[PDB]
Design an enzyme around this catalytic site. Structure first.
Site, PDB file in Angstrom:
ATOM      1  N   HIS A   1       0.751  -1.105  -0.037  1.00  0.00           N
ATOM      2  CA  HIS A   1       0.050   0.150   0.006  1.00  0.00           C
ATOM      3  C   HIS A   1       0.876   1.120   0.245  1.00  0.00           C
ATOM      4  O   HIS A   1       1.946   1.244   0.624  1.00  0.00           O
ATOM      5  CB  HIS A   1      -1.206  -0.005   1.297  1.00  0.00           C
TER       6      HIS A   1
ATOM      7  N   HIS B   1       1.059   4.960   1.450  1.00  0.00           N
ATOM      8  CA  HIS B   1       0.356   5.748   2.497  1.00  0.00           C
ATOM      9  C   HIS B   1       0.254   7.185   2.058  1.00  0.00           C
ATOM     10  O   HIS B   1       0.946   7.736   1.386  1.00  0.00           O
ATOM     11  CB  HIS B   1       1.162   5.655   3.808  1.00  0.00           C
TER      12      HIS B   1
ATOM     13  N   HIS C   1      -4.050   5.098   4.089  1.00  0.00           N
ATOM     14  CA  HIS C   1      -3.727   4.940   2.654  1.00  0.00           C
ATOM     15  C   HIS C   1      -3.770   6.172   1.828  1.00  0.00           C
ATOM     16  O   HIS C   1      -4.969   7.003   1.909  1.00  0.00           O
ATOM     17  CB  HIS C   1      -4.318   3.904   1.959  1.00  0.00           C
TER      18      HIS C   1
ATOM     19  N   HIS D   1     -11.395   1.396   0.948  1.00  0.00           N
ATOM     20  CA  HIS D   1     -10.393   0.507   0.724  1.00  0.00           C
ATOM     21  C   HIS D   1     -10.764  -0.701  -0.240  1.00  0.00           C
ATOM     22  O   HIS D   1     -11.977  -1.365  -0.070  1.00  0.00           O
ATOM     23  CB  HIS D   1      -9.850  -0.228   2.006  1.00  0.00           C
TER      24      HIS D   1
ATOM     25  N   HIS E   1      -8.696   3.064  -2.745  1.00  0.00           N
ATOM     26  CA  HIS E   1      -7.953   4.158  -2.556  1.00  0.00           C
ATOM     27  C   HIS E   1      -6.642   4.092  -3.487  1.00  0.00           C
ATOM     28  O   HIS E   1      -6.333   3.307  -4.367  1.00  0.00           O
ATOM     29  CB  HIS E   1      -7.171   3.989  -1.184  1.00  0.00           C
TER      30      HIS E   1
ATOM     31  N   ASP F   1      -3.918   1.418  -3.092  1.00  0.00           N
ATOM     32  CA  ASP F   1      -4.372   0.174  -2.950  1.00  0.00           C
ATOM     33  C   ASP F   1      -3.780  -0.740  -3.882  1.00  0.00           C
ATOM     34  O   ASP F   1      -4.361  -0.729  -5.040  1.00  0.00           O
ATOM     35  CB  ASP F   1      -5.870   0.125  -2.907  1.00  0.00           C
TER      36      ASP F   1
ATOM     37  N   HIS G   1       3.057  -5.028   4.334  1.00  0.00           N
ATOM     38  CA  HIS G   1       2.108  -5.275   5.603  1.00  0.00           C
ATOM     39  C   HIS G   1       2.877  -6.605   6.183  1.00  0.00           C
ATOM     40  O   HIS G   1       3.184  -7.575   5.364  1.00  0.00           O
ATOM     41  CB  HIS G   1       0.817  -5.235   5.493  1.00  0.00           C
TER      42      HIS G   1
ATOM     43  N   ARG H   1       3.176  -3.164   9.955  1.00  0.00           N
ATOM     44  CA  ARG H   1       3.974  -3.121   8.808  1.00  0.00           C
ATOM     45  C   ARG H   1       5.384  -3.628   9.007  1.00  0.00           C
ATOM     46  O   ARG H   1       5.911  -3.785  10.164  1.00  0.00           O
ATOM     47  CB  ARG H   1       4.516  -1.321   8.676  1.00  0.00           C
TER      48      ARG H   1
HETATM   49 CU   LIG Z   1      -1.949  -0.530   4.268  1.00  0.00          CU
HETATM   50 ZN   LIG Z   2      -6.501   1.196   1.071  1.00  0.00          ZN
END
Ligand SMILES: [Cu+2]
Ligand SMILES: [Zn+2]
Ligand SMILES: [Cu+2]
Ligand SMILES: [K+]
Ligand SMILES: [Zn+2]
Lengths: 165, 164
Positions: free
Chosen positions: A56, A58, A75, A83, A92, A95, A133, A156
């Site tokens: 992802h 951020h 995100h 999401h 997002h 994503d 992640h 993370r």
């Molecule tokens: Cu994430």
């Molecule tokens: Zn997202």
């Protein structure tokens, strides 16, 4: 025209963990040939736990605290959608789905995206943190209260700032 | 396009590696309006005493670590020669010298009107900020790279300028 809006743009992210995850190391290259073009994303990461991991972008690019993100912003989401999966229309900008690490801890990243931009449009991703992640992105389908916030992919493991080559 | 509106805040997390992994710092960049001034504040610790060149380089690529000798080019979209921050002929990335005293602490408070936190040709986000081994001669040094980069030596620490 302003050279930031011209020609092929190449961006990279140096990915690294810290502390107990200092063995997670890799890089990604982002390539977008034109303003209206898809972005190809290629790279390798080594040292990962086997299995899928959410990938992802951020909203913050702030790495003064390492891969610990102080802000609660979530995100990268300039169009204020929920999401989703990369192929979903409700996603997002940040994503990018899941990547997969094999039992040797290697992950080959190989994907294309049509939503992110390496040009300074509202979907610009340069200067933001790319996150790997702990576990898998459920693509907003897991029935968790945070499924539609971030895919419930956990903490993370490793981070890097997307920046210009 | 929100990248060109409101105030923009950027940061750079500065770190060395190897024998200089004790070099750690951060800088904040604040630019309230497009074409407005940019205010820079922060501190760096662990530096050898003396003056150190501080430059934004043309590349933001950290994938080979900070201490490469392959990316010595300063951010220079206007194709001028290296200079001091106050000089008329300067690179966008020419921010002069910071000073570290015997404590190894450098306190940085600067204002610049050349760099941009907005995506005009002077955009600095996504580029590496470099702290050099020794001082920037501000283009007045007589070495053949004085007008190319101020002859400030190798790198002690780096950080990518990114969005807060
Ligand atoms: Cu994430
Ligand atoms: Zn997202
Ligand atoms: Cu320099
Ligand atoms: K200006
Ligand atoms: Zn210069």
């Amino acid at each position: 025209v302003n050279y930031l809006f011209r020609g092929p743009v190449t961006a990279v992210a140096a990915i690294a963990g810290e502390g107990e995850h200092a063995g997670i190391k890799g890089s990604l290259t982002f390539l977008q040939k034109s303003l209206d073009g898809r972005t190809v994303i290629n790279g390798t990461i080594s040292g990962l736990p086997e299995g899928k991991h959410g990938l992802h972008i951020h909203d913050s690019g702030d790495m003064t605290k390492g891969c610990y993100i102080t802000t609660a912003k979530g995100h990268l989401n300039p169009f204020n959608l929920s999401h989703g999966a990369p192929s979903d229309s409700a996603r997002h900008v940040g994503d990018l789905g899941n990547i997969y690490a094999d039992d040797t801890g290697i992950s080959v990243i190989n994907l294309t995206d049509t939503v992110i931009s390496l040009f300074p449009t509202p979907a610009f991703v340069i200067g933001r943190i790319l996150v790997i992640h702990t576990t898998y992105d459920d693509l907003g389908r897991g029935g968790s209260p945070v499924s539609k916030v971030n895919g419930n992919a956990g903490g993370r493991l490793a981070c890097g700032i997307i920046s210009y080559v």
